[PDB]
Design a protein around this nucleic acid. Sequence first.
DNA 1: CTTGACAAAAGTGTTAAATTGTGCTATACTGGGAGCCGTCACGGATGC
DNA 2: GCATCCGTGAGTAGAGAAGCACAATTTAACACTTTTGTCAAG
Lengths: 39, 82, 94, 104, 222, 13, 1114, 263
Amino acid sequence: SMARPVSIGEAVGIVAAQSIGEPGTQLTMTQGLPRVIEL
Amino acid sequence: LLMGVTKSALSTKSWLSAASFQNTTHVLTEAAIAGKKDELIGLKENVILGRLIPAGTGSDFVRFTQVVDQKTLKAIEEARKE
Amino acid sequence: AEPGIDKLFGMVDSKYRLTVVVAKRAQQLLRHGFKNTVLEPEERPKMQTLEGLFDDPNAVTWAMKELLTGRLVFGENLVPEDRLQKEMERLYPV
Amino acid sequence: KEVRKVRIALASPEKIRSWSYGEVEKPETINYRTLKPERDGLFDERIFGPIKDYECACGKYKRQRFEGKVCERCGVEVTKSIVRRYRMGHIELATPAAHIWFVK
Amino acid sequence: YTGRGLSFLDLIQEGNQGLIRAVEKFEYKRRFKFSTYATWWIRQAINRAIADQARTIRIPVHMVETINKLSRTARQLQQELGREPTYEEIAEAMGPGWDAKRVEETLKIAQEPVSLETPIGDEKDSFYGDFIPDEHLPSPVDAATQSLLSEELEKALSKLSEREAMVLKLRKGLIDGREHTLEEVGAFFGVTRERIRQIENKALRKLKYHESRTRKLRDFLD
Amino acid sequence: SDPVRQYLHEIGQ
Amino acid sequence: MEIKRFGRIREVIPLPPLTEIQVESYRRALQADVPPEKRENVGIQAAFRETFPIEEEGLVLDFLEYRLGEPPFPQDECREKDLTYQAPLYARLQLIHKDTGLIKEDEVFLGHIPLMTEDGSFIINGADRVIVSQIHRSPGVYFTPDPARPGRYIASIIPLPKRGPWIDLEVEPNGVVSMKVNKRKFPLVLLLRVLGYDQETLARELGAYGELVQGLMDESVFAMRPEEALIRLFTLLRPGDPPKRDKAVAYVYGLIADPRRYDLGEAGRYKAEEKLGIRLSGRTLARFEDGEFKDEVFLPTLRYLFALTAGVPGHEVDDIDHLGNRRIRTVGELMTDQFRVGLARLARGVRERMLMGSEDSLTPAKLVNSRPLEAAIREFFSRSQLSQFKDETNPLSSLRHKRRISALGPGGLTRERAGFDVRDVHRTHYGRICPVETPEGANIGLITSLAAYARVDELGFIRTPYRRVVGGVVTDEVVYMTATEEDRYTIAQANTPLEGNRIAAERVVARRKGEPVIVSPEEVEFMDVSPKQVFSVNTNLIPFLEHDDANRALMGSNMQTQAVPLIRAQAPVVMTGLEERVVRDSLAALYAEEDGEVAKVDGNRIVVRYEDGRLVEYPLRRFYRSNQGTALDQRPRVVVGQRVRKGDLLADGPASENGFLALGQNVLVAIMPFDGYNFEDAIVISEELLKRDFYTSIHIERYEIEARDTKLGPERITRDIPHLSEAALRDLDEEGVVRIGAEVKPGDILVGRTSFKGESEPTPEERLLRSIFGEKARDVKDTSLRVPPGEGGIVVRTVRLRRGDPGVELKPGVREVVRVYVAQKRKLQVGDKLANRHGNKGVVAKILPVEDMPHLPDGTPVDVILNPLGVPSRMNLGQILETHLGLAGYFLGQRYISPIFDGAKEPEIKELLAQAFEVYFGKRKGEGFGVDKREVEVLRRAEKLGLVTPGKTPEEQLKELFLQGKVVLYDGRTGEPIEGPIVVGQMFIMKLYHMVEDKMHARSTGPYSLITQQPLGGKAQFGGQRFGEMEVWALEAYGAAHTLQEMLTLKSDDIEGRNAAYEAIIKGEDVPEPSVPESFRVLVKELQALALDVQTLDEKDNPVDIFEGLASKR
Amino acid sequence: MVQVDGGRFATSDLNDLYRRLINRNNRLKKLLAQGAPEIIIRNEKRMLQEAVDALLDNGRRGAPVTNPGSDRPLRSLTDILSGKQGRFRQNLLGKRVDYSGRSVIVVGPQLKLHQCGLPKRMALELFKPFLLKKMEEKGIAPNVKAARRMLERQRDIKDEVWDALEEVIHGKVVLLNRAPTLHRLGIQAFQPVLVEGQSIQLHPLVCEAFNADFDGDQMAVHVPLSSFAQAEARIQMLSAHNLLSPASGEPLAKPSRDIILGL
DNA sequence: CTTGACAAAAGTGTTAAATTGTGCTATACTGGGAGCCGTCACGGATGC
DNA sequence: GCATCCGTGAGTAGAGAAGCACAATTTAACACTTTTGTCAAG
Ligand SMILES: [Mg+2]
Ligand SMILES: [Zn+2]
């Protein structure tokens, strides 16, 4: 989000979960969201 | 070992976060018998207790930072090492 | 965007340290009624009011602009907390 | 001091009786006419605390100066009414019963 | 007896208690069979349990039997008049000592409490408890204005004399929390019950003059 | 699983 | 303003009554008008004949007849007094002493049957309600293939819902057929022996298929007698019970052979005979006669299953989603089913009452207790999922609600169990259920609407009409026919060309079992009546439906329901032809019963002198508040002395213009971006709309208060409220209620009420306060009703109901209730939601002055500016064609009727545009004006974009642009033209019920929860906003630790923190450090109630008390 | 067990569960004292075990216990803590908050990236405790309690109150949230600009991050109170400080729709 | 500032009605009642 | 190894149906001092 080294203290785990989950509804749904869920 | 996100989350040390996710009866049953002591490491545990999360401004790496002006700084310095 | 936000982010190793410094300075300014400010009278933040041009009451705005000047010293274990609070009260009565 | 850890463990029967301020012996809740809690019931002021701050059930004490005092007549401690959110009771079972969590 | 507030197993166990009492009081010298006499005690125990255990707010047997009579009478009037009876009609059919006021109060008493977990709407995500405010704990506004009044009152009492302010704080219970008598104050200072009433009014009068001059205390009166 | 049926069996003996 | 009608398809029959699904079904159930001796065995009449006679086993209670009396109160009285519009029910019963032989007859009062209004709704507790029809799997016998193992099929026997167990017949791998009852699997051989079947009978009937019969010939039980085989089966069904012949026969009879407990249903029985090729005597799986069991359906069911497994040509599996296998339970059936349940409960109470207590002297009045009957009826009309609060925002809203079909409800489905199959558009929905109309979201495919021409038959199957085609000529014979019957014919499309009645096209588009095929005219057997039968009423009101994507047509039809009535509502310029029928069938307007002359015309009533001479006075509903708060009023449309024919309009109803449905306004629309105020569906409107009061609606809000009996004294509704000045009480009359006509604002008193204060000594600070001022504390406090924030208006009605009033059944302890109606005239403002019929919706984001809006060269400004970027992705081109047709009608002064799929095409629209150009521009030439310099510049760009032909005169090029729906548009801000021609036309836009006035809410501090001590939710309760888990995740990701902690503690449930924070802020101080939330304290105590020792520790593992020593025993 | 304004009492399901346990426990004590046969004692002890089970976890074993007259299972202790409606997910991991509001959003084309249009009526309620202090500092009201009485009635609100509200919100920011909050930019901080009307004006360039359009969407407004909360929002959560997507590093606040088309 | 004495306010001891709790009904009566149903995948255990 | 039943989970906002007798306990109506509180007197 800042194009610079991450700052110590950022909850990157929450960011990672939101980053993966946010486009979940844009998947066409072994294909699409079901493929992601089983992985 | 490789486990899914659901099983990995339910096997975490902190029983507060695991009980608040799923299988509350199962998580609390094993935690109470084992006498588990939640150390409040993750974010969810401090949210439940209304504590400052150990991330961002709540992280110990920046939370204890002090701010002072030069006039106050010199006044403290000139009064101690004198 | 906040004025000089790029310069504010460049003075700290972690972006959350900047917020801690600004917020702690803001309450120092609020506690002493802005009498401990390092800003010159021509540098004090101002707001436009119908009666006239008056001082900005938002201490967060003051704290950010103070840090841009460079007259504030921030860090960890600079001075004891009890010594800091007592000394500021003496030299800035409130 | 600061809260740093949270521990969960089984509660012994002795520990449960240590938590409780009294045994709930009757299934009554409140009087149908006065709407006031019944003695030895699920809402008894003698067990869980006064309905209103610093006032006993009978009405002998109605002031904060008697903090920590238990009225000799009514048996209700003169304290803040917020203790009814924290003070617990207990039911002495005639026969032991298994906790369903550790069974099913 | 099912459907009257108690489960089937509760009815049986209560009925068993009456059966035990039947055995103790049964007499075979009368040559009556056991079921003839036991039925009275089994039904008695079930009836008493319903009158004692079928309601969250317990109602005595006399009022339960009164509530039962009122419903039976109202139902009989309903089927004869072809409509819901009025309270005057029900009271008249009940007999002497009954008016429409008593019928309404009895119906008000017969109101069972409603569950806090009763859902609203098709969705199973709302209950009655989510719409009931807590009226016991003071609101942040009420707590603040109490603190504002306390600091303005002690500020006004500062203008009083050292003893004059003490008397009002002691008579009105601003220190110990309890209103004291002019006597209970006559022992703290060793003065006469008329001494206090003499000054307590004088200190009261001076606060009235101060309040009229500043008007920093009227808004708290509401 | 049925307490009522269990009781009726017990009294049936 | 003439109306031009498009279309080529001639509809032989009109639309059926749009509320007949409600009205006719409830009439059939009640049978209130038919004499008792001619009542058929349906409805509640069937319920009486099923539960009765009640036999003690020598006392019999028999049913002879019933009757329904007149309702105690009229419909308006029930609404005003919060009563139920219902009719008393009396049953004429006789008690028969089989021993003595004496019969006594009397009429007993069974309670009240709620009555349906003329429009098709009910008034339950003073509130209008609609019973939504329910769709489910039809009863009968079904044969579905086993998914686990290929080549095997399972037989399913389904009775009426809650009227018997579901039965499964499956061929086990061992070869023996199994019967599953109540989750208990057992071999059908045992039960088949119970019903009197030998070894030779099974072989003689089922032995001509193959090895299947060999698995049905276990001789271990064939030699066993049926009586013990009945007991042997009784052990498998419910094991443990003592085997007794009397008890065993009752259980088996009550399971498959008792009409009182098992009911296959009229639809189920008909399906069973049609599928298995048999004839059932009753509606049970077996009959119990002559002390023995006789088979009814099991043998044909097993015969079909064996033949299906073998592979005979005449046997096929059943599609459970096929609309011939799905039926509709209407209001009559739903009420009858609940009536039967209550009647069964009443019969059980009668049976237990007639076996004890003065046996010789008993009367039917004493034995019958009608409360169980009334309780079931009251429960169905109040607390049922299918009994819904009537949606009456506009007359179309009520019409849609009565035609809704729901797969949910008691006995239906739940979303969890609703998959892509029940939620999908089956091929048999054609002409029976609208394919596009459905609530998007979690209810997609579960709540649907009946098709316009569709009707529900007696058995509950939806039928759609088709025109009979014989010998290639299309006749006027219309056959209403079900989906299963539709599969047997080749049905052509309604758009097939015809030369008179002969089919003209050699290739005909047709459907064979739902599949599109090309057939010859001689192969066509039926024809579609019209394109309108495929869609519902709401979808049929969308012009140019064929040009809109289905996803956006869904939105357009749904939002027509949300349109609010307008004081100047207009019928759309482009209509589909159903606008008049919707108003007529909604009963919101008033029409002449026969030919006559109007005698008196007034805003309150209309009097018409009919030809027969009788004077009929029609009161006019004026400023009535609907369930949604919209004002429903009828405005007279006739004058004194005017001659009216039968069916002529007398008074327009809500959202109607001269008998035509008027859900919005006809405004001039420019399709062009405007300075970002059109960004992402936002809408720009002109201030001229507000000047002439378009999109202005009247809304009425109801406020209620009760004066109660209290233990401290009764609450008094009075004008004398303590500690308030005259200004606050200025608008209150002597009785304490606000005067009618007063303007009320938030914080103003609507009615004054004083309540006795709870006995509690005051705080010493207050005691000194009263002592200083010499003011004695009063015994009453202000508990009056005030206007909530963001509300107000004009007081138009005050309703005061007092205890003892005739028909007012107040709750005990309530002396009186006062209801105040406040009406506000709402104009269109920023944030209000506008929409059209094509799914284009948006909120008003900017209101411009008239001089700022784009305008035509003649000086006419546009009314609405729409963003063209909302068209391409949504693929709803009907709004564009409506705009083009609206532009032509704006200058020609005419409206249009274009039926869906058969209406105005572009060649017809362009030729209308050519005529509209001759008045658009020919008028300019006569006035002495040539071509604008600004127009010349636009035409120079237009030929560069390929929009006009080079080399033509400016007049011809302007005409070319006009035929495309585009005009030269000037910018009101600059005066310069828009660099390209803009599509400008007249389009019908609706104002929706979602208004920013009713949705804006804010709270600093307010009520808190009882247990969690957290703020409540909802604007009505002045609650806070929910900061859920995902919002917490957002702050965690941002690293805003202190912002998160405030919301968790300081602003939600830190009782000490929130009190200190508020006090600090009002003193100009910073809020203090927060503390532990009260919800965590609740969790710990609840965990302790679960016998769990939860303790908070410190760095040194020592216990830390978070309860401040308030829970520690000394 | 609370009396509602109507006068009827409302109670939780736990009280009925507790009463059943006490009723069965007390009956067992009398049955034991009377020397009842083992069959009667066996049934009572079995019912006591089921009463304990229903109180702790209703429906876990056997048929759920329901109150007479309804089929609704009683809410036991396990149900209170578990599930989406349980204590953890409804009151601990998320809460309803004070100083919060909600309104329909409209496009603010003239707004700056860090600015939002906040209705004055919402801001008066959202910043009421701050406004009461500001009104007391000026000559609008003698004290806070009198100031609050003025704001209770709309027709008693002077025009000088609105001028004081502007000084309250100077430099302060508010939090705008649109549900669902799929990522962290579903909550952003904006400097509120007081506007006439009832709708929130939203910057066009932040619509993509919020996944917000203007066909009826609504947003929640939140007020950070302390210096830490204000500093975090102005530095870390400000819209103009969050221009790149945390998921990919690409610009998330970027030209779209009419802005691209015009350029 | 003490009388002082004096009426109101409050406390207090009886006594009555009123409300509430408990016992007892003697032909013979002896094993309940309602449901019963259109999801799907996933562990995890429990046995085969 | 495998087949089966049980348990778990499945987006977020907002708006929405016996009397009766008798004893035992409690309430409420009295009287009674006894007590504060108060307005004359110095
Ligand atoms: Mg939207
Ligand atoms: Zn006491």
